[PDB]
Amino acid sequence: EVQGWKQRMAAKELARQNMDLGFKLLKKLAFYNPGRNIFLSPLSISTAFSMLCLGAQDSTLDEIKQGFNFRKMPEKDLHEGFHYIIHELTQKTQDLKLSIGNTLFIDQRLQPQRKFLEDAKNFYSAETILTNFQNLEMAQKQINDFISQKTHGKINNLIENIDPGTVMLLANYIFFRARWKHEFDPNVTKEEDFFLEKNSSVKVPMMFRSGIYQVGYDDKLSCTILEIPYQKNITAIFILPDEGKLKHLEKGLQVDTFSRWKTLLSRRVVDVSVPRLHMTGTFDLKKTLSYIGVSKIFEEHGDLTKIAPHRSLKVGEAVHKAELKMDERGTEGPLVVKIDKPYLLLIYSEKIPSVLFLGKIVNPIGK
Template identity: 40%
Template sequence: MKSALYLCLLLLGLPVQGQYVFDLSVEQQEQKIPHSPEDHSPAEGENLAHVKIASSNADFGFRFYKQVREEVGSKNIFFSPLSISTAFAMLSLGARSNTLSQLHKGLAFNLTEMEEQEIHKGFQRVLQLLNDPHREVQLNMGNALFIDDRLKLLQKFLDDVTNFYYSEAISSNFQNSLEAIKEINNYTETKTHGKIIGLLNSLDPDTVMVLVNYIFFKGYWEKPFNSFATRENDFLLDAKNSVKVKMMHQNKAFNIHRDKKLSCWVVEIPYKGNATALFVLPDEGTMKQVEDALLKETVSNWMQSLEKRKIYLDLPKFSISGSYDVKSLFEKMGVTEVFSNQADLSGVAEKTLLKVSKAIHKAMVDVSENGTEAAAVTVIEMVPMSAEIPPPPHIRFNRPFLMIILDKTTHSILFIGKIVNPAAKED
């Protein structure tokens, strides 16, 4: 009988003291993760491991999004593709044969374009860059393994997860499942500053290891919205139904793009520091068309096509969350063996056959007016108002839209979301 390995991907987003925040857990691990400055020139960029995996992570993120869309229908979507791919990439250190091949394929890693070692070096570098305490955007990510007292991990696996993924190993007694659940819940509650409480309510009786990945993001709008301009307004759920929302407003210059082919507006709203959010507003009736076109090439084209222009911008305040059964979603994406009795995770532990019994992912985001004015000067110059012909467009995010949060330092897509109903609080 295979012992169970539980993957737990924890994310939480919330406002802290009225600031705009994705609080996706954990205190900074400065003592554990070395922070090194970016010591490369742009010309070297394409050969860097973290740049190579960024491309794969984007491919994976949009494939996963489309699978989630099939599952949830017309509900809100919000998740971190980087969190999920990091957890499964770390697990792949102990995978062998077809189990490893399926994981690589599912995570969109092409071993003809990069070596297996480069994958892990790429994540190592991402962790270093995200956990840099000198960044204006606070963005931290880390991993933990809760390991049963009876399970003897192979030294190489332990060394690799520590070296590449800076994972901490925590000894647990899974024979006393109630105590193990309490320990893991206490850990996650502490790491999320009391915001994720009682995440686990049960564990498979055969569980011998639980893997936790967390990510924490705290960003300030470069151009905060004025709360005095926020008004209650209608958000159109569909042709017949609407809900009342708090609609924020700005009348400033933003980087925008009108994608005529896909019939959508793209508005970039940057954070102070090297992170930014893309808000994508499909024309009425074109959401599926835009979603179907979600590929790394599409986003790259949007980013390259952005032009600074004054606009009238309406954006709702919203707080949404999502909980996902990653095991079910991965199985539909062709990653099946790691969850079955055919799983080959022989590189994890001595004399113990392992399979993944469950993998969950929870994320939440809170968007509001607040932020801090950027001290740095914007790189792109504003277009003088007198040169604006025709007049500024009025872009109203008063119907379902997409949100993509990008970290420019690591070239990573941190979060992908679809806001169908900004007033919905449930998962």
């Protein structure tokens, strides 16, 4: 209880760092891809490359730690911190279904080392699965089926392409199902307009509830903040930019922003309209990580011999997939906040405190 203090402290500092990462990834992703939905888990992304530090050495290890900012604390604390984060969040209960998966798919000719395997399992619950990469079509079919089975059909078609010569593929995935502190009534959910532009709109299933919620307005970022709590100590933070202020919001988000919003939010009676969601986000981590200058893990440098003793070993391919369902489900028993235009969604763990998911929702029924 008391013992686990250092694990929580390390986790509190790492969660501060995944918040920054998340805002950096969204800002980059939205700059290159405007007008599109972005849905990732900066926390799950981080566990994948922190797990790899258990098997990386020299220039590769150093670049991962610099890019991800794992440099402030000792390596022992980094791994014990992430072990704590994963152990606390991983659940299969009536209230919360949450899992962070990390699977290394390595060529069946190679021999993953006992020590790396025990460490990855013990600290991250990460597993290595031997694959026949000489048959690329069958390998993709085997990987996708392994994950679909593992996640009970929550994480499907993770891999779309395998480059020839790939001997090591990293698969990082997260799914989420949670009950709200107070359920929405399905009988009150109606098809409503979601404005894709000021001029254009589509009909979306819109949920409605009236009750007490932590609500506020940020005049610096020009946005409305609404928080809807889950039954377990997790919160859905809805950030609704003002008409013409979406870019300003994306460029303005930082770590200090949260402690600033704490003084802007108060518990008030709000008439809430929130779209239902079934979001997925798939990312090629070789491209994504170029935003934080991490590339050596994807190149041959003789730095991964702790994973498998072959000098030419690199991570050939790395994919992230985030999945979330947002509906009326919750625990059974005014201002106006209408989430009917493009918005940001932060799934925030309060007990860690970590950013589990970060989404840019331009269309709740599209991409």
